[PDB]
Amino acid sequence: NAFAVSSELSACGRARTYRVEGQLFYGSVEDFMAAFDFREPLERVTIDVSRAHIWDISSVQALDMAVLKFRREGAEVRIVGMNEASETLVDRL
Amino acid sequence: AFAVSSELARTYRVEGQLFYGSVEDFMAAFDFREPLERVTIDVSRAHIWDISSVQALDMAVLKFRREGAEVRIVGMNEASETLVDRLA
């Protein structure tokens, strides 16, 4: 399988890190969006895409939606690894 | 429809067409047990046609770091030009 997300919670339950691995493209966007618990109460969310490749603008746009949805729920959101994930698609776009 | 060669610091040169069908034969081209400081996998001579073929490249890159050398990738951009363009 080509896409996988896991997460780890903070001790106090205030911070969650999602670890995104593998291939993000239109065909994985639905499972990608399903991996996040958007209404979990959190102060901080990290989406770490360092181990993944973003292969199309759909997927970039899905990632930006995920970010906006967490923000809307009150979380401060960080993306880690965007440069590595997105190198593929940008040098080629 | 692809071939893999190498030069001894090792560089693997992948050429040809990378599809679903060839992945295991692809994984067999590499010797990950060779303790090595730095491995380059150069895919500039190859076309990555689908998501499964790139996943296999990422897996190979991972077993080289696991063992563990530092791994780079030349030509990912031109290798995956076919996949990026295919998906867009």
Side-chain angles (χ1 to χ4, degrees), chain A residues 1-91 93, chain B residues 1-36 39-44 46-63 65 67-71 73-88:
Chain A
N1 207 24
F3 174 73
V5 182
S6 61
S7 76
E8 184 188 320
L9 196 56
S10 196
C12 293
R14 300 188 333 241
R16 185 168 300 264
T17 305
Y18 288 91
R19 186 177 280 176
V20 186
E21 298 184 53
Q23 314 312 326
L24 299 172
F25 72 107
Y26 71 92
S28 59
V29 152
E30 199 193 307
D31 293 328
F32 165 81
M33 290 308 275
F36 297 110
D37 181 9
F38 285 123
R39 301 157 312 197
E40 170 184 16
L42 297 164
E43 295 188 340
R44 276 164 198 179
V45 189
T46 300
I47 307 176
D48 179 350
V49 293
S50 59
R51 292 151 198 97
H53 296 300
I54 295 175
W55 289 119
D56 53 32
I57 281 167
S58 282
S59 306
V60 180
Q61 291 178 333
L63 180 59
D64 285 337
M65 264 173 35
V67 167
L68 288 150
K69 185 44 171 135
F70 274 112
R71 284 201 197 151
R72 216 134 56 221
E73 301 289 317
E76 193 180 80
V77 193
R78 265 235 284 180
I79 295 186
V80 160
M82 176 60 130
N83 47 180
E84 296 135 82
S86 84
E87 203 185 346
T88 34
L89 183 64
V90 292
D91 291 1
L93 217 147
Chain B
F2 73 97
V4 179
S5 56
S6 42
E7 197 159 29
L8 224 32
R10 188 177 284 281
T11 293
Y12 287 76
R13 197 201 168 86
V14 188
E15 24 183 74
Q17 310 318 316
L18 294 178
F19 294 118
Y20 176 77
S22 49
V23 312
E24 58 261 68
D25 289 345
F26 169 85
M27 287 311 283
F30 303 84
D31 175 31
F32 311 115
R33 321 223 163 204
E34 173 173 330
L36 295 174
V39 182
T40 295
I41 291 162
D42 165 349
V43 292
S44 58
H47 300 291
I48 291 159
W49 290 108
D50 52 27
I51 286 300
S52 319
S53 293
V54 233
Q55 178 59 17
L57 170 56
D58 281 345
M59 292 305 104
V61 145
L62 234 82
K63 305 207 192 210
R65 287 168 188 162
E67 219 61 28
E70 171 227 296
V71 187
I73 300 167
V74 186
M76 179 50 136
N77 316 73
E78 66 187 288
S80 84
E81 160 152 64
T82 34
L83 172 67
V84 172
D85 290 349
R86 181 177 181 199
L87 292 170

